């Protein structure tokens, strides 16, 4: 299964949800890169909540 | 089972629309009437080997 993410959708995710941007700030430049972070987020319980 | 994501940097949207119209046009071509159906073939020579 494939999901498409535009950068406008990423900006809307960051603006509408501060928790995702909070995880992005301390996870993406530190340990693992951006698409791995989005895959982990979409496979997480936070996306379901 | 597996999760795959697509990241587009706001430039390849026109490419996906080009693909979408390309399956659209091949579907309309494969559902088009044949040339012998929309046009009368009696004005041309008879079929043969």
């Amino acid at each position: 299964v494939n999901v498409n993410l535009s950068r406008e959708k990423i900006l809307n995710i960051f603006e509408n949800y501060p928790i995702v941007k909070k995880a992005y700030t301390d996870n993406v430049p530190k340990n693992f890169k951006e698409p791995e972070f989005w895959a982990r987020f979409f496979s997480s319980k936070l996306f379901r909540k | 089972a597996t999760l795959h994501i697509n990241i587009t940097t706001a430039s390849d949207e026109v490419a996906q629309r080009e693909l979408q119209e390309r399956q659209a046009e091949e579907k309309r071509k494969q559902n088009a009437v044949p040339e012998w159906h929309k046009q009368s073939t009696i004005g041309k020579t008879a079929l043969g080997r």
Partner: peptide, 24 residues
């Protein structure tokens, strides 16, 4: 089954990561 499912998921995430890094 559980270990092969979770290891399949983690290699799928790594495959997405290195595919993106090869593209970028």
């Amino acid at each position: 089954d559980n270990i092969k499912m979770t290891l399949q998921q983690i290699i799928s995430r790594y495959k997405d990561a290195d595919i993106y890094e090869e593209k970028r």
